Amino acid sequence: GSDLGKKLLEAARAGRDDEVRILMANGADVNAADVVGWTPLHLAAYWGHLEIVEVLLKNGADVNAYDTLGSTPLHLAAHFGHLEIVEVLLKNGADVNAKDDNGITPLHLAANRGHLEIVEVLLKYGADVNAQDKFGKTAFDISINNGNEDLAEILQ
């Protein structure tokens, strides 16, 4: 964990595009990570900062970095409903079917929060619709427990 790295982790979280731009010019570690293993790309994906996601990816950020519980930026973007960010990540190679330590996928997470467009985008990019978490649940299972009829039909 380096100094400019720390500054990058904060700037990304805080969505300060300009500061991030300058930091990129100065070579701030795009692979910096906090104690729980979040990279600036995790932070931007979490808090929804679209431009910074794009800029980080231009500058070599690991699109498939995982935190200490195995969660990726795609996990975070899908869970918190950041549609344009989910599409950018997938275009830049994000593992559509990445499982975290619990066997949970971006699809599980999107389905659980009722993010219809995101579910569709994840299916478009090849998300495994039959993927089971550590409890053997699918995104369909999650849909019907939640009583989400729209989403339930999407997953047929």
């Binding site: 720390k6 104690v35 979040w38 200490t68 519980l69 975290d100 330590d101 619990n102 949970i104 550590k134």
Partner: protein
């Protein structure tokens, strides 16, 4: 009245003596404290929820209490924070003048009725209601120096053997322990537990069963069968008392008949109730007591009594235990009382010297000497009557007041001496005439200062509390000064003064004095000649005067405004803040650096560093700490290099280099009770149901806009804490139900192990104490440790926590704030240099108005007070101007002549401003106290002259110029004597360093500079004022 007492000098003495006795009595009965009550009454509700995160606290405790704070009288506002240490504090602030006891009981009663809506474990910990707006008399640290006791050992000792006896000490109003008494600590081992198919639930159950008080009854109890011989209480099970007993608690009997004891699945020891704070005193384990003054007590008595008690405990101290005093406000009271005596003595000396220099006889010299103690004692009596205390502010008013009593005495004696030398009249009839000449001037000066200071007492809130202390000392002193001058001093003049031959101005005397008289009599002629020439050309002097008034306005508006000047109070703070998620150990490393810095590179100034790890003022947690730095006495720290500002400067500059930590020294607020009256204090409010994340976004939006006006807004920042990573764990209900694992077993196992659980009480050496279960440290550190905890299913199988849960990282708040019952975020900031806080507040309101829908705001604290203080000021100044005018109009029987006096006010004010600006001081309350006294004093010179001149025209038919010239001729000496005495007396205030030298320098330079220009300008300008006013009208 003067004629009455001139013939009755013994009656006069009797009144003087009764006044002296009244005052003497008052001094015996008067409370003695550092400060009056200044802050508005506040009541804090405090509750603790072991193992709870900020939101759990807020949503099961804080909100419920808040929804019940209804039907309480005189509430101004309510605020709270809920944090992830498991703590809530709700602080209710009441109108100034509210009875603090009634406010507290009203709050406690509303709480008591919400208690059944709180979580069981919070009801168990209890919810404390306390007066919050009180401050510490002193802090007693207790350390151990032979490395034999930990801070828990010390705290338990203090609580068992010192606390109660300090509370019982005379004058002590409240005592807080820094730490806890011991608690019985059970540190569970998940491996051992699982080995015997046990869970934390079994541990808690067994403890409740086998450490308990069981009622039983009596043998031969009523109603008995008759004939019964014995009545006796049955004693059954009573609480456990030792670690061995808890160790031997039976948990399980196996099949092979062997026994599983508590000590077989747990470490057992006496420990602390919590471990959130590490306190060290110069690197050594430390506890301590924070002590407050009882209402109406004597701070000095109490401090001596506290020390006396500590001494008699010292023979029973364990080895290495030592008492230490890192904070003691008692010096300040001591110094202030000394200052008053010191000023009293040197003023008596100064008046002696000045009277003798000019009047050249000891008898004349005695009369003012007798007057001062009389008037000063009476002031104490009045002070007592109106329910004030002896405190730093009132004592400060006393030292100023002494400078003003002086004049009445001098003016009376000098005028009698003049009248004798000029008319040859004998002492008695010289005195009768002389009093008729100065009576009204004496009353008028008292009236003008009253009309100025009394309205200042009616400022509300904090400002009015400070002013009041000066208002009542200065004005009482004034009333009594006039009273004594109309009763005792004329009696003394007529009886003690020796006759003077007509035309005996001592010009024929010998050596120095004969020289001085000839020198002075000639100077007076040069003086009056000047005035005559001036009066032949008033036009240019009106122009000159406009230049001054214009200058005054310029200087006033460009003088920076503050509320209270920083003081060197012999202690200061060092903040330590590490990044989010930083651990207790890392913070301790930084604090050790800080401590090392001061005990090394500040060895000549620093007495001690008390490092508190885990404490902040605006957010707790493992990543914040504070170092309290205590200094050697000011005397041992010569020069500005060694005062708090300099030391702080170098500490901060040295600490800039430090790692990943923000570390910087900073001074106390001038009045710690009042607590920082700098800048503004703004509340951003969730007015719909936007929620925490949305409120953060608006906060950030507002903070962005503010930072774009460096010209108007500076250092505009959150008072609270940013969101941090938190480990979110989800229990799968279905899998729990399928394995037959109860949700209650799951949640008890997790909470008790990782959070700790208060089980019940035991009794340790005769004192009741808490029993806590919790995991040993090494089984609750990391996410991997989670799967080491097993819960027992209905079917007796042990199930790993990993089988029915899943987890992920997320952000959330470590400290949630609320204002008046709604989600809030407090923002601090201040006006840019050159700008008024008023201006800066307006821009904030302007920026706040562009925020997203549903975000509101409110002003709190100092801002709330200022918003209502500044709204009061014009009407109060207006009343003062009107009453000053009306008294002079009555004094002169004229609607116009009061202007000739009133015009002198800028002559004094310009000096005050000049001295302030030159010395680089600011417009704070002490400077404002200085201006006010500067008004009264410039008015004094003017009133003397205008009175002589008007009386000369009315009674002796003299022309306008003839009277004016004779008036300033007569007024010159008493104006010069009273100014020389005042200027010399007030000088210590000007040059003083350390120990309240802030306030002193502020009042001193204003008051001295003001007196210099007022007397240097008045003696030429008020003849002009009188002449053109009488000419125009």
């Amino acid at each position: 009245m003067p004629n009455f007492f001139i013939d009755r000098p013994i009656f006069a003495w009797v009144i003087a003596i009764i006044i002296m006795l009244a005052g003497g009595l008052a001094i015996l009965k008067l409370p003695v404290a550092q400060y009056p009550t200044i802050a508005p009454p506040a009541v804090t509700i405090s509750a603790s929820y072991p193992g709870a995160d900020a939101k759990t606290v807020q949503d099961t405790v804080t909100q419920v209490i808040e929804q019940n704070m209804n039907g309480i009288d005189n509430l101004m506002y309510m605020s709270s924070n809920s944090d992830s240490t498991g703590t809530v504090q709700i602080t209710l602030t009441f109108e100034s003048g509210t009875d603090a006891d009634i406010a507290q009981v009203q709050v406690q009663n509303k709480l008591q009725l919400a208690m059944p809506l709180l979580p069981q474990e919070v009801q168990q910990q209890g919810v404390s209601v306390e007066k919050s707006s009180s401050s510490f008399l002193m802090v007693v640290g207790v350390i151990n120096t032979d490395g034999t006791m930990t801070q828990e050992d010390i705290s338990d000792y203090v609580a068992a053997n010192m606390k109660d006896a300090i509370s019982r000490t005379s004058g002590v109003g409240d005592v807080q322990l820094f730490g806890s008494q011991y608690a019985m600590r059970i540190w569970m081992n998940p491996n051992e537990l699982n080995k015997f198919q046990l869970t934390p639930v079994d541990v808690i159950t067994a403890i409740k069963a086998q450490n308990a008080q069981v009622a039983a009854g009596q043998l031969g109890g009523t109603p008995p069968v008759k004939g019964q011989q014995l009545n006796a209480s049955i004693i059954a099970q009573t609480r456990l008392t030792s670690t061995e007993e808890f160790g031997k608690i039976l948990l399980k009997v196996n099949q092979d008949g062997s026994r599983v004891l508590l000590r077989d699945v747990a470490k057992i020891e006496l420990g602390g109730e919590n471990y959130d704070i590490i306190a060290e005193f110069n690197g050594q384990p430390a506890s301590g007591l924070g002590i407050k003054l009882a209402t109406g007590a004597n701070a000095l008595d109490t401090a001596a009594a506290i020390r006396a008690e500590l001494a008699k405990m010292e023979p029973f101290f364990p080895s290495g235990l030592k008492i230490v005093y890192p904070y003691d406000t008692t010096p300040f009271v001591k110094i202030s009382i000394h200052e008053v005596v010191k000023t009293l003595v040197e003023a008596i000396i100064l008046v002696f010297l000045v009277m003798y220099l000019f009047l050249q006889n000891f008898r004349a010299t005695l009369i003012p000497t007798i007057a001062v103690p009389v008037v000063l004692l009476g002031t104490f009596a009045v002070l007592a009557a109106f329910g004030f205390s002896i405190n730093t502010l009132t004592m400060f008013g006393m030292v100023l007041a002494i400078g003003l009593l002086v004049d009445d005495a001098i003016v009376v004696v000098e005028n009698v001496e003049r009248v004798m030398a000029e008319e040859g009249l004998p002492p008695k009839e010289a005195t009768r005439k002389s009093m008729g000449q100065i009576q009204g001037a004496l009353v008028g000066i008292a009236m003008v200062l009253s009309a100025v200071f009394v309205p200042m007492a009616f400022f509300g809130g904090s400002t009015g509390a400070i002013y009041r202390q000066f208002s009542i000392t200065i004005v009482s002193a004034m009333a009594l000064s006039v009273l004594v001058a109309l009763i005792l001093t004329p009696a003394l003049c007529a009886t003690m003064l020796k006759p003077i031959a007509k035309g005996d101005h001592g010009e024929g005397k010998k050596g120095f004095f004969g020289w001085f008289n000839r020198m002075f009599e000639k100077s007076t002629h040069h003086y009056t000649d000047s005035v005559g020439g001036i009066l032949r050309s008033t036009g240019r002097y009106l122009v000159l005067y406009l230049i001054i008034v214009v200058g005054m306005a310029y200087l006033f508006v460009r003088l920076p405004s503050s509320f209270l000047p920083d003081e060197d109070q012999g202690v200061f703070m060092t903040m330590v803040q590490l990044p989010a998620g930083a651990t207790q150990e890392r913070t301790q490393k930084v604090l050790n650096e800080v401590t090392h810095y001061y005990l090394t590179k500040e060895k000549n100034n620093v007495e001690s560093v008390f490092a508190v790890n885990g404490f902040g003022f605006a957010g707790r947690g493992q990543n914040t700490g504070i170092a309290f730095v205590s200094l050697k006495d000011w005397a041992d720290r010569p020069g500005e290099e060694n005062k708090v500002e300099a030391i702080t400067m170098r500490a901060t500059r040295a600490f800039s280099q430090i790692k990943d930590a923000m570390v910087f020294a900073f001074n106390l607020p001038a009045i710690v009770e009042l607590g920082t009256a700098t800048g503004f204090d703004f509340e951003l409010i969730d007015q719909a149901g936007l929620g925490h994340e949305k409120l953060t976004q608006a906060r950030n939006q507002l903070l962005a806009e503010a930072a774009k006006h460096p010209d108007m807004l500076t250092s505009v920042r959150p008072n609270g804490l940013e969101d941090t990573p938190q480990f979110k764990i989800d229990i799968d209900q279905e899998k729990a139900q399928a394995l037959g694992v109860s949700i209650n077993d799951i949640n008890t196992t997790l909470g008790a192990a990782w959070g700790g659980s208060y089980v019940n009480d035991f009794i340790d050496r005769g004192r009741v104490k808490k029993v806590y279960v919790m995991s040993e440290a090494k089984y609750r550190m990391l996410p991997d440790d989670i799967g080491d905890w097993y819960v027992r299913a209905a079917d007796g199988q042990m199930v790993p926590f990993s089988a029915f849960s899943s987890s992920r990282w997320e952000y959330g708040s470590p400290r949630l704030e609320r204002y008046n019952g709604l989600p809030s975020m407090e923002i601090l900031g201040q006006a840019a240099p050159g700008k008024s806080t008023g201006e800066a507040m307006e821009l904030m309101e302007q920026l706040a108005s562009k925020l997203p829908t549903g975000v509101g705001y409110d002003w709190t604290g100092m801002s709330y007070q200022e918003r209502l203080s500044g709204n009061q000021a014009p009407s109060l100044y207006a009343i003062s101007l009107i009453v000053v005018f009306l008294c002079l109009a009555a004094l002169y029987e004229s609607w116009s002549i009061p202007f000739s006096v009133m015009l002198v006010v800028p002559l004094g004010v310009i000096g005050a401003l000049l001295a302030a600006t030159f010395r680089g001081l600011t417009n704070d309350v002490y400077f404002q106290v200085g201006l006010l006294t500067t008004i009264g004093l410039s008015a004094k010179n003017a009133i003397l002259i205008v009175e002589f001149a008007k009386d000369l025209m009315d009674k002796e038919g003299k022309g306008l110029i003839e009277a004016t010239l004779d008036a300033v001729r007569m007024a010159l000496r008493p104006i010069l004597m009273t100014s020389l005495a005042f200027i010399l007396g007030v000088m210590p205030l000007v040059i003083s360093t350390g120990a309240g030298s802030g306030a002193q320098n502020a009042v001193g330079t204003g008051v001295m500079g003001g007196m210099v220009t007022a007397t240097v300008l008045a003696i030429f300008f008020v003849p002009v004022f009188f002449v053109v006013v009488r000419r125009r009208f």
